[PDB]
Paper text:
The enzyme LkcE from the lankacidin polyketide biosynthetic pathway of the bacterium Streptomyces rochei represents an interesting test case for understanding such gain-of-function, as it exhibits a monoamine oxidase (MAO) protein fold yet also carries out a macrocyclization reaction. The catalytic mechanism proposed for LkcE involves initial oxidation of the amide function of LC-KA05 to an iminium ion. This is followed by attack of a C-2 enolate anion on the iminium to give the 17-membered lankacidinol A (2)8—an enzymatic intramolecular Mannich reaction.
Numbering used by the authors:
A (entry chain B): 3 to 133, 139 to 438
B (entry chain A): 1 to 133, 138 to 438
The structure:
């Protein structure tokens, strides 16, 4: 039971928090706390100086579609932010001579070896959504796919979203099925993908401007204490009082900040699974695949791979930003290596970033759904990646869902797919 | 409305995909005779044997594309016949007269790509956003109203639509939703090869099986000359003989249907008259000169000859080539296997394997409206109509229309378990008016 013009705090300045604060700001007194020096979190664009001018390179969140991300798209559109097609072309390289396969054509020894399996996979995945809670790994095993397919094709292609470190093979089937079914990932063609003009940051910079002074950068919240009068927030050596609090931070962070003598919170937010990611923005051209170049996503496997004990060895994924259409005139290399197994030359490094991605096993999905129990109690609310469906659309729409619960309705009722997303995420979240 | 019973003497006129599938389903419950003018079953679905060093191959000269999502009934049918399928992605390369005046969906090379990239980009967005939100408008009209360049219309849109309308087609007059959905469903794209499948050993493989199942009932080289309903039934005149049937199913083009049909009713002329067609000449050849120098690797190769003249674009040429060597099962074949549709340039005759001449229906909003209207004459004088001109575009629509008729005559939809195949069936049934 929330009255208008309440004092509301939003903890976490990532996509979900920023969009939640921004929508909440219309009807309530809103304050947004953010630990780091910018808004976005995983949505980060780093300025790179080049012969064409200053480019803002997306190191984390970078992909969406008008179909997959309707709310994010309408938002970018309403902000006069242009988008552009950056197709998901993939090149996978293995230690043996010509042990490769790619999205664009049929070249490589690995392509020869696995072609029939790639072919059956697409069919099976397209036929699957029709006529559930099973891992991709389980599926591949029961449907007689080779171990070589699992580790030389499936695991590398899934690394683009999941990160090379991820136990991707343990992720729910529908997530993989739909990534194929909706041409996001393919073995035969580059996936239909878009990026935002001047980086993903552009939409967040606008939100920051709209919120102005309500945004508290470099203000990590240390504790959240509900009381009888209202919730108390401790941040930057000050105590702030609020009617309600919205957590837009990771479940592990939420729990660390959250201070209550209730152990339901420990049950619900305890041991959410995460995957660490190290994003390396660099100019070391040695990372490009000799046979690779032209492909956007370049996966490389180090020398001592060994198919038996495939799990111990890990791969490295590189984004070749030069391939991006707006970066076509740039003379200097712009590369992003995630979790580089081999050392990246330090003289060529621009910046490093360290994040953690949530795991997507059917158990993790079940864990996420269960939060509706604590939704709205002690004047607390939870949005973000850990409370919603995977991807940026899911993160920001969870923020939207909470704003609707606090009076500010879904801002795009006209956009039928955006309303469809909203309704879907609302059903998924306990709200 | 109508009463039909078991073991009726039923004739199916036209041995194309629609007719063959209709006869095949009908044969279960009725005495069925299938009349086919040509020496084989399939019509547009034709696979020609080519002898190569690696093996003897059946090359699809028409009707080579489908996929499991778009064509559920055709797919389940191929599957039930133990016919394998394989991914043949729709890679496209377009060539124009000027130096490096090209664009392709595999990469960003070419001067045409540089000139048109931003338009390709906006088009995909606009097309993806359209279905979710009028219906009766041509692609050309849409492109004009949404400020797309004339260069986009004739150097990009018209060539890419040439893939399955044919180079001669007034493709720009075709309905918007057909183009919107071709893009929306990754069948056609400017950024990636479309997701398409081909049938193992040619498209003919499924028809050869149907022909075997039908056996004797199939009367090849038996063009029907006239169809005469009477008070007792319907009389069919074919191959200098008169056959009597309880009901007749037309699985042929409306212009053919009308020519054969003879009644003292002018509703039939109103309904089947004015069906618009586009001629296609499919040339199976080995002349390697037809491949684009910059092109090769792309499956579909479009070439615009010298003296194009953008202002006089509407009356302009266009030649589309399929480079079959690019197909995965044809990878070890040493000899070239090319198909040029409507070649403007003189093709070397010593390199020609065979030619085929067909006519494709037009897809303007008016033509679509014309197709739906055929529900008026459906079931009258013991007559039934199925095929391309009575249904949605593509092979799935054609065969499914035959199935819809079969259900009307007792034989229900053979794949109720396959939810998408049943969904198609239901959709086509509503479209057809039965
Ligand atoms: C490398 C990488 C690539 C990705 N690529 C894509 C992609 O292409 N497409 C896509 O759809 N998704 C992608 N994602 C998914 C991504 O996780 C989400 O899209 C989105 O960023 C989630 O937003 P969020 O706010 O819920 O989490 P986050 O973006 O991580 O937001 C959490 C925020 O909380 C802040 N915070 C932490 N501690 C405190 C504290 N004590 N007090 C206050 N604030 C605090 C953090 O500083 C951060 O700003 C990617 C993620 C990563 C890591
Ligand atoms: C070059 C070409 C390429 C195509 N490619 C594709 C593709 O990739 N994918 C796709 O989905 N569709 C494709 N199509 C669409 C195609 O038209 C339909 O898929 C399919 O032909 C529908 O079959 P139909 O039986 O209704 O027509 P048709 O296949 O043309 O069948 C008509 C039949 O009637 C016969 N007939 C004619 N006169 C008589 C008579 N007097 N008596 C008896 N029988 C007669 C003809 O000989 C023929 O066999 C293509 C068509 C062409 C021409
Ligand atoms: C939304 C309609 C999608 N249908 C198609 O693209 C057709 O099946 C296409 O493959 C085709 O062959 N159309 C008829 C012209 C040959
Ligand atoms: C099916 C949704 O897939 C996604 O959006 C993934 C998880 C990304 C782009 O991180
Ligand atoms: Ca990643
Ligand atoms: Ca460079
Ligand atoms: Ca590329
Ligand atoms: Ca130039
Ligand atoms: Ca698409």
């Amino acid at each position: 039971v929330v009255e208008a013009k309440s004092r509301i705090a939003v903890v976490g300045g990532g996509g979900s928090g920023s969009v939640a604060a921004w929508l909440l700001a219309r009807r309530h007194d809103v304050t947004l706390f953010e630990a780091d020096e910018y808004l976005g979190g995983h949505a980060y664009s780093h300025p790179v100086e080049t012969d064409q001018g200053t480019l803002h390179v997306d190191m984390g969140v970078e992909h969406f579609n008008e179909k997959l991300s309707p709310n994010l798209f309408r938002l970018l559109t309403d902000f006069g932010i242009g988008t552009y097609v950056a197709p998901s072309s993939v090149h996978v390289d293995f230690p043996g001579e010509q042990q490769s396969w790619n999205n664009l054509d049929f070249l490589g020894e690995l392509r020869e070896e696995l072609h029939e399996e790639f072919d059956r996979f697409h069919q099976e995945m397209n036929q699957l959504p029709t006529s559930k809670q099973m891992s991709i790994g389980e599926y591949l095993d029961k449907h007689g796919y080779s171990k070589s397919f699992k580790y030389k094709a499936m695991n590398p292609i899934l690394s683009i979203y999941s990160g090379c470190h991820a136990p991707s093979l343990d992720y729910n089937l529908m997530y993989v099925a739909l990534s194929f079914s909706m041409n996001l990932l393919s073995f035969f063609s580059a996936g239909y993908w878009r990026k935002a003009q001047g980086g993903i940051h552009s939409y967040l910079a606008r939100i920051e401007s709209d919120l102005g002074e309500r945004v508290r950068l470099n203000t990590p919240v240390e504790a959240v204490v509900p009381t009888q009068s209202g919730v108390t927030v401790l941040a930057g050596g000050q105590e702030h009082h609020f009617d309600q609090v919205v957590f837009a931070t990771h479940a592990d962070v939420t729990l660390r900040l959250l201070r209550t003598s209730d152990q339901q919170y420990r049950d619900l937010l305890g041991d959410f699974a995460y995957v660490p990611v190290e994003s390396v923005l660099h100019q070391d051209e040695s990372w490009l695949s000799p046979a690779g170049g032209g492909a956007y996503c370049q996966f490389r496997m180090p020398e001592g791979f060994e198919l038996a004990r495939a799990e111990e060895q890990m791969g490295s994924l590189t984004r070749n930003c030069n391939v991006l259409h707006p970066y076509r005139k740039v003379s200097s290399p712009i590369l992003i290596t995630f979790d580089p197994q081999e050392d990246v030359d330090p003289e060529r490094v621009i910046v490093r970033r360290e994040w953690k991605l949530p795991q997507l096993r059917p158990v993790d999905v079940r864990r996420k759904k269960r939060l509706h129990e604590i939704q709205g109690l002690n004047g607390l609310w939870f949005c973000g990646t850990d409370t919603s469906v995977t991807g940026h659309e899911g993160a920001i729409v969870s923020g939207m869902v909470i704003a609707d619960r606090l009076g500010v309705p879904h801002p795009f009722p006209d956009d039928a797919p955006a309303a469809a997303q909203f309704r879907g995420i609302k059903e998924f979240m306990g709200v």
